[PDB]
Amino acid sequence: GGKVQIINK
Amino acid sequence: GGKVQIINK
Amino acid sequence: GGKVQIINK
Amino acid sequence: GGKVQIINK
Amino acid sequence: GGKVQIINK
Amino acid sequence: GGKVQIINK
Amino acid sequence: GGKVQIINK
Amino acid sequence: GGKVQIINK
Amino acid sequence: GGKVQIINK
Amino acid sequence: GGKVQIINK
Amino acid sequence: GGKVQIINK
Amino acid sequence: GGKVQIINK
Amino acid sequence: GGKVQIINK
Amino acid sequence: GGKVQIINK
Amino acid sequence: GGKVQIINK
Amino acid sequence: GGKVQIINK
Amino acid sequence: GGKVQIINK
Amino acid sequence: GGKVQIINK
Amino acid sequence: GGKVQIINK
Amino acid sequence: GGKVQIINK
Amino acid sequence: TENLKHQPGGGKVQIINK
Amino acid sequence: TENLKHQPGGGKVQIINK
Amino acid sequence: TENLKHQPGGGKVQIINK
Amino acid sequence: TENLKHQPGGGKVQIINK
Amino acid sequence: TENLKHQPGGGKVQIINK
Amino acid sequence: TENLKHQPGGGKVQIINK
Amino acid sequence: TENLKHQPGGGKVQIINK
Amino acid sequence: TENLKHQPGGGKVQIINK
Amino acid sequence: GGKVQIINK
Amino acid sequence: GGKVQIINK
Amino acid sequence: GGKVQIINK
Amino acid sequence: GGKVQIINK
Amino acid sequence: GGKVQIINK
Amino acid sequence: GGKVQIINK
Amino acid sequence: GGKVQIINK
Amino acid sequence: GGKVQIINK
Amino acid sequence: GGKVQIINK
Amino acid sequence: GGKVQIINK
Amino acid sequence: GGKVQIINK
Amino acid sequence: GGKVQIINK
Amino acid sequence: GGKVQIINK
Amino acid sequence: GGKVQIINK
Amino acid sequence: GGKVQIINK
Amino acid sequence: GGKVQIINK
Amino acid sequence: GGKVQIINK
Amino acid sequence: GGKVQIINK
Amino acid sequence: GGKVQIINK
Amino acid sequence: GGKVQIINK
Numbered sequence: 001g002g003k004v005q006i007i008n009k
Numbered sequence: 010g011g012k013v014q015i016i017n018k
Numbered sequence: 019g020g021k022v023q024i025i026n027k
Numbered sequence: 028g029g030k031v032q033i034i035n036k
Numbered sequence: 037g038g039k040v041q042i043i044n045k
Numbered sequence: 046g047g048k049v050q051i052i053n054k
Numbered sequence: 055g056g057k058v059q060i061i062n063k
Numbered sequence: 064g065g066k067v068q069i070i071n072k
Numbered sequence: 073g074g075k076v077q078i079i080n081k
Numbered sequence: 082g083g084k085v086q087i088i089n090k
Numbered sequence: 091g092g093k094v095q096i097i098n099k
Numbered sequence: 100g101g102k103v104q105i106i107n108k
Numbered sequence: 109g110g111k112v113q114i115i116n117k
Numbered sequence: 118g119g120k121v122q123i124i125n126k
Numbered sequence: 127g128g129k130v131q132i133i134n135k
Numbered sequence: 136g137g138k139v140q141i142i143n144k
Numbered sequence: 145g146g147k148v149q150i151i152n153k
Numbered sequence: 154g155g156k157v158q159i160i161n162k
Numbered sequence: 163g164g165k166v167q168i169i170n171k
Numbered sequence: 172g173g174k175v176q177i178i179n180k
Numbered sequence: 181t182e183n184l185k186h187q188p189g190g191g192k193v194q195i196i197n198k
Numbered sequence: 199t200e201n202l203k204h205q206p207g208g209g210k211v212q213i214i215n216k
Numbered sequence: 217t218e219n220l221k222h223q224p225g226g227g228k229v230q231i232i233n234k
Numbered sequence: 235t236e237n238l239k240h241q242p243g244g245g246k247v248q249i250i251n252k
Numbered sequence: 253t254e255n256l257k258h259q260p261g262g263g264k265v266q267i268i269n270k
Numbered sequence: 271t272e273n274l275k276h277q278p279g280g281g282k283v284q285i286i287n288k
Numbered sequence: 289t290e291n292l293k294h295q296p297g298g299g300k301v302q303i304i305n306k
Numbered sequence: 307t308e309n310l311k312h313q314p315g316g317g318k319v320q321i322i323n324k
Numbered sequence: 325g326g327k328v329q330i331i332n333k
Numbered sequence: 334g335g336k337v338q339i340i341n342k
Numbered sequence: 343g344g345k346v347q348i349i350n351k
Numbered sequence: 352g353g354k355v356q357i358i359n360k
Numbered sequence: 361g362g363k364v365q366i367i368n369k
Numbered sequence: 370g371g372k373v374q375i376i377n378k
Numbered sequence: 379g380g381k382v383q384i385i386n387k
Numbered sequence: 388g389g390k391v392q393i394i395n396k
Numbered sequence: 397g398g399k400v401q402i403i404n405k
Numbered sequence: 406g407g408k409v410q411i412i413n414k
Numbered sequence: 415g416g417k418v419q420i421i422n423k
Numbered sequence: 424g425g426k427v428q429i430i431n432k
Numbered sequence: 433g434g435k436v437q438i439i440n441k
Numbered sequence: 442g443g444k445v446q447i448i449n450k
Numbered sequence: 451g452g453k454v455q456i457i458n459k
Numbered sequence: 460g461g462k463v464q465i466i467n468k
Numbered sequence: 469g470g471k472v473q474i475i476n477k
Numbered sequence: 478g479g480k481v482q483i484i485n486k
Numbered sequence: 487g488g489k490v491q492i493i494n495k
Numbered sequence: 496g497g498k499v500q501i502i503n504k
Contacts, residue, residue, distance in 0.1 A: 001020075002011045002063075003165060003174060004071040007142065009018045009095065009104040010020045011054075012156060012165060013062040013071040016133065016142070017026045017106050018077070018095040021147055021156065022053040022062040022071075025034045025115065025133070026097045027077045027086070030147065031044040031053035031062075034115070034124070035079050035097075036086040038046025038055055040081055040090065044053045047055030047064055049081065049099055054063045056064030058099065058108055062071045067108065073092035073101070074082035075111060075129055080089045080098050082092070084111060084120065091101035093129060093138055098107045102138060109118040109127040110198075110216040110234050116125045116134045116160045116169070117149055119198040119216045125151045125160070128137045128216070128234040128252050134169045134178070135144045135158055137234070137252040143178050144167055145154045152161045152208045152226070153193045156164045156173075161226045161244070162171045162191070162211045165173045170244045171180045171209070171229045180227060180245045181199040183266040183284070191208035191226065194255045196271050196289075198216045201219045201266050201284040201302070209226040209244070212255070212273045214289050214307075215233045219284050219302040219320075220238045227244040230273075230291045232307050233251045237302050237320040248291075248309045255273045263280030263298060265369045269328045269337075270288045272290045280368035281298030281316060283378045287305045287328045287337040289307045298368055298377035299316030301387045305323045305337045305346045316377060316386040319396045323346045323355045325334045327399060331439060332341045333365045333374070334343045336399055336408060340439065340448065341350050341367055342374045342383070343352045345408055345417055349448065349457060350359045350376055351383040351392065354417055354426060358457065358466065359385055360392040361370040363435065363444065368377045372381045372444060372453065379388045381453060381462065386395045390462060397407040397416070401441050401450070404413045405472060406416040406425070410450050410459070412440060413422045414472065414481060415425040419459050419468070421449060422431045423481065423492060428468050430458055432492065432501060434442030434451060436476045436485045441450050442477065443451030443460055445485045445494045450459045451486065452460030454494045454503045458467045460495065463503045469479050476485045479488045486495045489498045 002072045004013045006015045008106055011063045011072055013022045015024045017097055018104060019028045020054045020063050021030045023032045026079060027036045027095055029045040029054050035088055036077060038048055040049045042051045048057045050059045052061045056066055058067045060069045075084045075093045077086045077095045093101055094103045096105045110120065111129045112121045112215050112233055114123045114132045114215060116151060117158060121197045121215055123197060126149060130233050130251060131140045132233060133142045134160060135167060139251050141251060143169060144176055147155050148157045150159045153191050153211055154163045157166045159168045162209055162229055163172045165175060167176045169178045171227050171247050180247045183201040183268065185203045185264060185266055187205045187207050189207045192210045194212045194257060194273055196214045196253060196273060199217060201268065201286065203221045203266060203282060203284055205223045205225055207225045209228045211228060212230045212275060212291050212293065214231060214271060214291060218236045221284060221300060221302055222240045224240060224242045227246045229247045230293060230309050230311065231249045232289060232309060239302065239318060239320055248311060250307065253271045257275045259277045259279055261279045263368060264282045266284045268286045270326065274292045276294045278294065278296045281300055281377060283301045283369050285303045288326055288335065291307065291309045293311045295313045295315060297315045299386060300318045301378050302320045306335055306344065316395060319387050324344055324353060326336055328337045330339045332367050336345045338347045341376050342365055344354055346355045348357045350385045351374055359394045360383060364373045366375045370379045374383045376385045378387045382391045384393045400407050400409045402411045403440060408417045410419045412449060414483060418425050418427045420429045421458060423490060430467055433477060434486055435444045437446045439448045439450060443486060443495060444453045446455045448457045448459065452462050452495060452504060454463045456465045456467065461504060471479055472481045474483045482491045484493045487496045491500045493502045495504045
């Protein structure tokens with residue numbers, strides 16, 4: 001069911 | 010059911 | 019049922 | 028039923 | 037005053 | 046005031 | 055005030 | 064105020 | 073100096 | 082100096 | 091100086 | 100100087 | 109002088 | 118001089 | 127002098 | 136002087 | 145059948 | 154059958 | 163059958 | 172059957 | 181017949197953080 | 199007949215962070 | 217016959233971060 | 235006959251970050 | 253800080269004499 | 271910091287004498 | 289920082305004498 | 307930082323004498 | 325059913 | 334069913 | 343069923 | 352079923 | 361100066 | 370100065 | 379100065 | 388000065 | 397037929 | 406037929 | 415027919 | 424027919 | 433005086 | 442005086 | 451005086 | 460005095 | 469006519 | 478006529 | 487007529 | 496007429 005992973009810095 | 014992981018700094 | 023984990027600093 | 032864990036500092 | 041609402045289920 | 050709403054299910 | 059809404063399912 | 068909406072499923 | 077990790081919600 | 086990890090909700 | 095990792099939601 | 104990793108949502 | 113944050117999971 | 122935070126889980 | 131953040135998962 | 140961020144997963 | 149997070153030195 | 158995250162030195 | 167993330171030194 | 176991410180030194 | 185010897189003890193560690 | 203010897207102990211580590 | 221010897225212990229590490 | 239010897243231990247590492 | 257740790261054990265040994 | 275760690279063990283040995 | 293780590297073990301050995 | 311790590315083991319050896 | 329003479333010094 | 338004489342010094 | 347004489351010095 | 356004489360010095 | 365017979369198994 | 374017979378297995 | 383018979387297996 | 392018989396296997 | 401070890405000094 | 410080891414000094 | 419090892423000094 | 428090793432000093 | 437030893441078997 | 446040793450078997 | 455040794459078998 | 464050794468078998 | 473003198477000084 | 482002198486100084 | 491002198495200084 | 500002198504200084 002989706003795997004959304006976000007890296008922002 | 011989704012696994013959303015977020016890293017922001 | 020989702021596992022959402024968030025790290026922000 | 029979800030496991031939401033948050034670390035912010 | 038903005039209505040800051042967060043829900044962690 | 047902006048309505049900041051976040052939902053972590 | 056903009057309605058910032060994020061949903062992490 | 065722009066309606067910033069993001070959905071992570 | 074000094075690191076400052078504020079997070080204005 | 083000195084690190085300051087405020088979090089204004 | 092000093093690193094500043096603010097995150098305005 | 101000093102690195103500044105702001106993220107204005 | 110020495111400031112270090114170390115997070116793992 | 119020495120300031121260090123270490124979190125794991 | 128020394129500032130270092132180290133994250134792994 | 137020394138500032139370093141290291142992320143792996 | 146569930147989630148598990150371990151840190152073993 | 155589930156998710157698992159380990160950090161072994 | 164699920165997702166898994168490991169960091170082994 | 173799922174996703175997996177490993178870092179082995 | 182069956183010699184079994186085990187050292188599955190978690191690692192040994194010295195830490196220094198300051 | 200069966201000699202089994204095991205050292206599956208997690209690693210040993212010295213840390214320094216400051 | 218059956219000699220089995222094992223060292224599947226996770227690595228050993230020295231760290232320095234400052 | 236059966237001699238089995240194993241070193242499938244994860245690598246050893248020294249780190250320096252500063 | 254003098255953090256010391258020794259393991260000068262006489263070694264582990266499993267013998268069999270049939 | 272003097273972080274020391276020795277493993278001068280006499281070695282592990284599994285013998286068989288049939 | 290003097291981070292030291294020795295493994296001068298006498299070595300692992302598995303013998304068989306049939 | 308003096309990060310040292312030695313492995314002057316006597317070596318691993320598996321013998322067989324039939 | 326064999327015979328073993330072990331002399332060590 | 335063999336015979337073993339081991340002399341070590 | 344053999345015979346072994348091992349002399350080491 | 353053989354015979355072994357090992358002399359090392 | 362001295363006869364020594366050390367055997368370590 | 371000294372006779373030595375060290376055997377390490 | 380000295381007779382030495384070291385064997386390391 | 389000295390007779391030495393080192394064998395390392 | 398007997399591992400016979402007999403000495404005749 | 407007997408590993409015979411007999412000495413006649 | 416016997417590994418015969420007999421000495422006649 | 425016997426690995427015969429006999430000495431006659 | 434000196435030393436001496438015999439494994440005569 | 443001196444030393445001496447015999448494995449005469 | 452000196453040393454001497456014999457594997458005469 | 461000197462040293463000497465014989466593997467006479 | 470057996471004259472066996474064994475002297476181990 | 479056996480004259481066996483064995484001297485192991 | 488056996489004259490065997492074995493001297494191992 | 497056996498005259499065997501074996502001297503191993």
